[PDB]
Design a binder for this molecule. Structure first.
Ligand code: 017
Ligand code: CL
Ligand code: CL
Ligand code: NA
Lengths: 99, 99
């Protein structure tokens, strides 16, 4: 796909057996999803942005289908106002910025 | 250019005659720069990010060069942790997301 940026670049993802919508975010180092359960081990992390930091759970080796493209990587889970696909998984689907 | 996402997509910007670095951020509606002086009047705006909201100064019709492309548009100034180029100016320089 080529995605213009006139509106937010929202896509459908599948994670943990659940379909969700998420923002493709080149400004995010990491992927962060709103509170949900995921299997396996986790460790606590703080992640910071505009407005300050939030505490999240870091799960490693989680598979996510992103607009029909599979990726595996770390997923943070916590009180983010929107689900965000960050660079750690955007690389894996071959996403690039073009101008 | 075609910019991969293995590293942060940082580019040089020029605003008020000064070179700065900024992040190309598809997850940002709005361009926001760290504190600096800009001409004209400003308007109030609240910006909500991962960690809560911040107050910023909204300047309209500001001339800004981004990675060698000319844009003229709205720039917010406030305590962002990093200079960010959001979709309002990414559209002006013709940027798309591709995968
Ligand atoms: C601020 C950037 C350096 C980092 N952010 C990614 C960014 O794209 C967020 C992503 C985002 C989007 C919506 C709400 C919260 C965060 N956008 C954002 O805060 O933009 C604000 C300015 O324009 C506005 O439009 C969106 C909210 C405003 S972040 O959400 O804090 C974040 C930080 C670290 C990770 N790993 C993942 C995400
Ligand atoms: Cl990862
Ligand atoms: Cl104010
Ligand atoms: Na795991």
């Amino acid at each position: 796909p080529q995605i213009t940026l006139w509106k937010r670049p929202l896509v459908t993802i599948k994670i943990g057996g659940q379909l969700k919508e998420a923002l493709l975010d080149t400004g995010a180092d990491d992927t962060i999803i709103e509170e949900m359960s995921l299997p396996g081990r986790w460790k606590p992390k703080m992640v910071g942005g505009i407005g300050g930091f939030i505490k999240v759970r870091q799960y490693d080796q989680i598979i996510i289908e992103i607009a029909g493209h599979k990726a595996i990587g770390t997923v943070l889970v916590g009180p983010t106002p929107i689900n965000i696909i960050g660079r750690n998984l955007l690389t894996q689907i071959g996403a690039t910025l073009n101008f």
